[PDB]
Write a protein that binds this ligand. Sequence first.
Ligand SMILES: Nc1ncnc2c1ncn2[C@@H]1O[C@H](COP(=O)(O)CP(=O)(O)OP(=O)(O)O)[C@@H](O)[C@H]1O
Ligand SMILES: [Mg+2]
Ligand SMILES: [Mg+2]
Ligand code: NA
Length: 359
Amino acid sequence: KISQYACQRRTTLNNYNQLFTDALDILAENDELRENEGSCLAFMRASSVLKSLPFPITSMKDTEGIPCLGDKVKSIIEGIIEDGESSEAKAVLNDERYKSFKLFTSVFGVGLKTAEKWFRMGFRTLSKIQSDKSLRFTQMQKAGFLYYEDLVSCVNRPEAEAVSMLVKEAVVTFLPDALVTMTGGFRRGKMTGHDVDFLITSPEATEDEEQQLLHKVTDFWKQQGLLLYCDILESTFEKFKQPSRKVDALDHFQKCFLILKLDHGRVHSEKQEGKGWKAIRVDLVMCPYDRRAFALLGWTGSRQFERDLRRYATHERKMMLDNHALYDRTKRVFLEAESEEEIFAHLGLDYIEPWERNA
Ligand SMILES: Nc1ncnc2c1ncn2[C@@H]1O[C@H](COP(=O)(O)CP(=O)(O)OP(=O)(O)O)[C@@H](O)[C@H]1O
Ligand SMILES: [Mg+2]
Ligand SMILES: [Mg+2]
Ligand code: NA
C-alpha cells in the first residue's frame, strides 16, 4: 500500500508517468501564480505520488489504491489517457499571464511581485523589459539580465564537479578541516540543474571562524575575478530554539547566493567555443558541525520530500523537524544525529537514499 507521504516512498528519476506529471506540475504552478495554495498542494501531491510508480498508468483501473488522487486529478488523468494530452495544461501553456510569469521569473532576481508588476505595465518580452529607459532594476536583476543566456542553459555534471573543485580549493585555504558536500538536485542524481548547492561545515572552527568563512571565500574569488554576483545572508541561527511549526520551514544558517565565472578549461566534459567561460549560479550554506545531518537532509530535497518529512514528523511522531534540529515533544528532548540515517531511524522511517528523494 503506497503511502501518502513522499518520505515513505522511493522516487527515482525514471519517471514512467511524465505525460501525467508534466501536466499536473503545470496546473500546480498556475495555481501558485493565481494564489490558489490549496489547489496547488493537491496537484503537487498527486504529481509526486505518480512520480513514485514503477510502471506507467495506461487505464483508470491502474489508479486504484493510489492515494492523493482526488476527483479533479482523476478527470485530468482520464483526459490524458483519452487523447495523449491534457486540455487543462494546454490552456495554461497558452495563457498570457502564465507565459509572462514563467518568462519573467526565468530571470535571476525576478519573483512573483516584479513579474506581476511588469505584466500589468503591458510588458510581454524580456527584450522590451531590458531596453526600457524608465524601469529600475535591482543589482540581482541586473546580473540576471547580464548573464541570462548562461543561467538559462542547464548546469551539467562536468560543470557542477568543476564548481565543487573551486569551492573545496577556496574553503580549505581558510578552514583546512572543512567538509564540503554538494547538495540539491545533483546530490539526488540529476544530470542538470539551475544551480550548484553546497553545505560547508567544520568540526574545529570557532563561532567567529564559522561566520567569517563565506566572507573570506567570496573576497578570494573577487580578487581572482571570478565573483560575478554575491549576496551573503548572515545567520539568525538559535542554538536552543524549538524547530519550526511552518509548512515550509525557513533556514536560519549563514548562506550566500552567488554567480561564479567558470572557465571552460576547468570543465572535463565530452566537448574555446565562445567567450571561454560560463556564469554559474552557486549557493553556499555554512552550518555548525553538530547540526550538519539536519542541514544536509534539508538541503538535499526535493522540496516535496522535505514538506512530507516535516508533516510526517509532526502528525505521525509528534516530532518537530527543520534544517537545524529534531525535537521530540513527548520525551521533551532534542534528538542528536551524526548522519541522515540516524534522523530517519529517530523518525521510525526506512532510510531513503538521496537519489530516491525525487518526490
Ligand atoms: N531557503 C531554504 N530553506 C530551506 N531549504 C532550502 C532553501 N532553499 C533551498 N532549499 C532546499 O535545498 C534544495 C536545493 O535547492 P534548490 O537549488 O533551490 C532546487 P534543486 O532541488 O536543487 O533543483 P535545481 O537547483 O535544479 O532547481 C531543495 O531541494 C530544498 O529542499
Ligand atoms: Mg539546486
Ligand atoms: Mg539552490
Ligand atoms: Na527568478
